[PDB]
Design an enzyme around this catalytic site. Structure first.
Site, PDB file in Angstrom:
ATOM      1  N   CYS A  15      16.352  46.769 105.303  1.00  0.00           N
ATOM      2  CA  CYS A  15      15.444  46.699 106.451  1.00  0.00           C
ATOM      3  C   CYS A  15      16.208  46.674 107.772  1.00  0.00           C
ATOM      4  O   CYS A  15      15.743  47.236 108.776  1.00  0.00           O
ATOM      5  CB  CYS A  15      14.552  45.459 106.370  1.00  0.00           C
ATOM      6  SG  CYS A  15      13.517  45.304 104.911  1.00  0.00           S
ATOM      7  N   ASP A  49      11.988  49.900 109.898  1.00  0.00           N
ATOM      8  CA  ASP A  49      10.530  49.891 109.939  1.00  0.00           C
ATOM      9  C   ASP A  49      10.000  50.938 110.905  1.00  0.00           C
ATOM     10  O   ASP A  49       8.944  51.525 110.663  1.00  0.00           O
ATOM     11  CB  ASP A  49      10.000  48.512 110.366  1.00  0.00           C
ATOM     12  CG  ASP A  49      10.310  47.415 109.378  1.00  0.00           C
ATOM     13  OD1 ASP A  49      10.676  47.717 108.226  1.00  0.00           O
ATOM     14  OD2 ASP A  49      10.176  46.229 109.757  1.00  0.00           O
ATOM     15  N   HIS A  92       6.217  46.655 102.779  1.00  0.00           N
ATOM     16  CA  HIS A  92       7.203  47.716 102.637  1.00  0.00           C
ATOM     17  C   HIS A  92       7.534  47.913 101.159  1.00  0.00           C
ATOM     18  O   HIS A  92       7.144  47.120 100.304  1.00  0.00           O
ATOM     19  CB  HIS A  92       8.418  47.408 103.517  1.00  0.00           C
ATOM     20  CG  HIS A  92       8.050  47.233 104.964  1.00  0.00           C
ATOM     21  ND1 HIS A  92       8.548  46.224 105.757  1.00  0.00           N
ATOM     22  CD2 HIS A  92       7.170  47.917 105.739  1.00  0.00           C
ATOM     23  CE1 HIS A  92       8.022  46.312 106.967  1.00  0.00           C
ATOM     24  NE2 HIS A  92       7.183  47.332 106.983  1.00  0.00           N
ATOM     25  N   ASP A  99       4.626  52.607 108.442  1.00  0.00           N
ATOM     26  CA  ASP A  99       5.975  52.093 108.649  1.00  0.00           C
ATOM     27  C   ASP A  99       6.935  52.898 107.785  1.00  0.00           C
ATOM     28  O   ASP A  99       6.677  53.122 106.598  1.00  0.00           O
ATOM     29  CB  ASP A  99       6.093  50.605 108.273  1.00  0.00           C
ATOM     30  CG  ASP A  99       5.590  49.638 109.372  1.00  0.00           C
ATOM     31  OD1 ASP A  99       5.011  50.065 110.405  1.00  0.00           O
ATOM     32  OD2 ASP A  99       5.785  48.415 109.181  1.00  0.00           O
ATOM     33  N   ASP A 130      10.713  48.661  99.911  1.00  0.00           N
ATOM     34  CA  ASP A 130      12.118  48.478  99.597  1.00  0.00           C
ATOM     35  C   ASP A 130      12.420  47.087  99.033  1.00  0.00           C
ATOM     36  O   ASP A 130      13.578  46.650  99.055  1.00  0.00           O
ATOM     37  CB  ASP A 130      12.987  48.792 100.826  1.00  0.00           C
ATOM     38  CG  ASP A 130      12.511  48.107 102.119  1.00  0.00           C
ATOM     39  OD1 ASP A 130      11.489  47.359 102.124  1.00  0.00           O
ATOM     40  OD2 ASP A 130      13.218  48.317 103.137  1.00  0.00           O
TER      41      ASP A 130
END
Lengths: 364, 364
Positions: free
Chosen positions: A349, A121, A247, A198, A249
């Protein structure tokens, strides 16, 4: 007449060098779970955290998470780091730190930091650059300090270690006309007052990078990454159907040249840079509904890590996903991670790939 | 398929573009003198502040400078700003801020910030880049915040606005076993734990930059600025005989192609990049002995500012040097600045040239 001083560093190749998400992994940073802190409840959290968990985060704001869940999250990330070591990969870990101390800056105060568990992040790495991103969460303002021994080392050995301007994060960052009850469609909780993003809103594909706007990443932040990376790289921004996106992902994961995992339910129109790519759609998670997920959707199981074009790490109890990865022709390495995942990330992550073998290519 | 979102910014040319100290000045940031704060007494100040003034800085640690002196200094920087505008130059000024609010970070606390008067210290600009430097002083940790409306504006119109990693500035930033009476040989008060530098330790000469190590600029910081600037630029580091150095702009000041002002007393060996340059030795200062100087030597009057190759702004009471500049063939614009000079800087420190007309060339 006086001669100039010789250089203070010796000539050394950068230990940071990575262009894709799938090239053979050589060095990776892996987060830790130490005595973490529940962030202070504010609008950043209110906009992002699942509605069902609001009572918990309001009750424990600025205090600790349940010790039994943490102990299990800790053992799971240590198991992951042991598995990466066994695969021959160099592993770095951040230091422990004091997350529970008062923090005071010109335009906000917090009760401390958050955690050191999600290096993806707060750090972005491509080519020989490793970038400390300008994060919108006030409790993550000093998140990189725990990684600073690693970063100074990479720097002394040739890495381009740089940072976005540390944000002010005054109350001007937040939208004043925000409806928290309007779950759809996506309206960003952060404004364009300063660059914010991020790193986990972007995925690496060689000369091409895919990203999205989210509650963590604004247009200025994307433009800052565009300018800092330079004309060697193109960042393509796309827009998906996930409510309250943070995010990327759990939506788009390039796994090999020409092969991309895509959350079908949230991507009804596929980015055009994948027109000639093979599209793999992951089945749903097998986690019980009972299982706490403080900071993510029920699709956190797709947040996988590639060791090379054909090898993926996936959570051990995700039998439908595991089975799919095998039918697609991937070797699977299984690891328990469901309790780490409660805290908002899975293998991707929790890691940052800083060195993969290969040169900068185009794949679209 | 879905097409990517268009760029958010325009093709506007960077309003930051500067390569030398002497090209015709088009836009400049000029500091302000608001309600500023005496820094908390620490080891950086002990190494750097002249010994005469240690009683004052210990006794007024964290509290204010005398208003009488401050008012005169504030008057004089406003006279300067108006003089620059009358020359047709665009002038930008930072906002006011609260210098008297406690700051708490993971590894240090302060009773506030310092001042917004010296943009030359906290920002470095060459080419299209404007850089938030990593300063060694804890009281200067948020110094760029007052400048963030200017920086955000330049960024949206194309400037490359970047930052060094914000330092931790733990107590490990200082040498634990340092003795302060042996001013020679030079020994840095700050360690090599992280990159640190003040921008005023560097002067621009197009493709060539001249800098020094100081109590605010360490070896890792110089390397950081070398890497970040890239191979277009070369930084030459030299060593001079000033006791307890902090900045370079009362020692070496390039004024035009082939002409450099060198403080003869401190520079017994001239840097070899000046072998073919005309060398101008300034005469001594005109200020009476009684005039307060908190944070400088009595050479503060050489810290001049060039508006073009033949035009220099000099403190109006410096009769000897004013006459020297005229003998040397320079137009002198006079400005009262002695009251400002009490707080550690003169015209060059008070400003940051962000745009001068010209291209990137070599003068060596």
């Amino acid at each position: 007449y006086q001669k100039e001083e010789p250089s203070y560093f010796s000539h050394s190749p950068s230990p940071v060098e990575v262009y894709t998400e799938w090239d053979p992994l050589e060095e990776v940073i892996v987060g830790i779970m130490d005595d973490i802190r529940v962030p202070d409840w504010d609008k950043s959290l209110k906009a992002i955290i699942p509605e069902e968990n609001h009572d918990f985060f309001q009750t424990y704001s600025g205090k600790r998470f349940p010790e039994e869940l943490l102990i299990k999250a800790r053992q799971e990330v240590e198991t992951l780091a042991q598995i990466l070591q066994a695969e021959g990969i160099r592993v770095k870990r951040p230091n422990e730190s004091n997350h529970h101390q008062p923090i005071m800056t010109p335009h906000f105060t917090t009760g401390g930091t958050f955690y050191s568990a999600m290096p993806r992040d707060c750090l972005f790495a491509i080519g020989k650059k490793i970038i400390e991103v300008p994060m919108s969460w006030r409790s993550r303002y000093f998140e990189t300090f725990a990684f600073r021994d690693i970063l100074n080392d990479y720097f002394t050995r040739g890495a381009e270690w740089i940072a976005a301007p540390k944000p002010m994060l005054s109350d001007d960052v937040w939208e004043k006309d925000f409806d928290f009850e309007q779950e759809f469609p996506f309206r960003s909780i952060i404004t364009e007052v300063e660059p914010l993003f991020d790193a986990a809103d972007f995925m690496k594909m060689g000369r091409d990078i895919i990203g999205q706007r989210s509650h963590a990443t604004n247009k200025k932040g994307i433009e800052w990454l565009r300018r800092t990376l330079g004309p060697d790289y193109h960042i393509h921004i796309y827009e998906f159907d996930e409510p309250a996106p943070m995010h990327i992902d759990t939506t788009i994961l390039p796994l090999a040249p020409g092969r991309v995992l895509i959350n079908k339910g949230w991507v009804p129109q596929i980015p055009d840079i994948f027109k000639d790519w093979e599209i793999l759609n992951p089945p749903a998670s097998n986690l019980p509904d009972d299982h706490p997920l403080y900071m993510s959707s029920n699709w956190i199981h797709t947040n996988v890590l590639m060791l090379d074009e054909k090898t993926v790490i996936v959570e051990e109890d995700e039998e439908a996903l595991i089975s799919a990865f095998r039918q697609w022709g991937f070797k699977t390495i299984l690891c328990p991670f469901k309790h780490f995942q409660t805290f908002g990330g899975s293998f991707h992550c929790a890691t940052l790939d800083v060195k993969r073998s290969g040169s900068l290519k185009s794949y679209i």
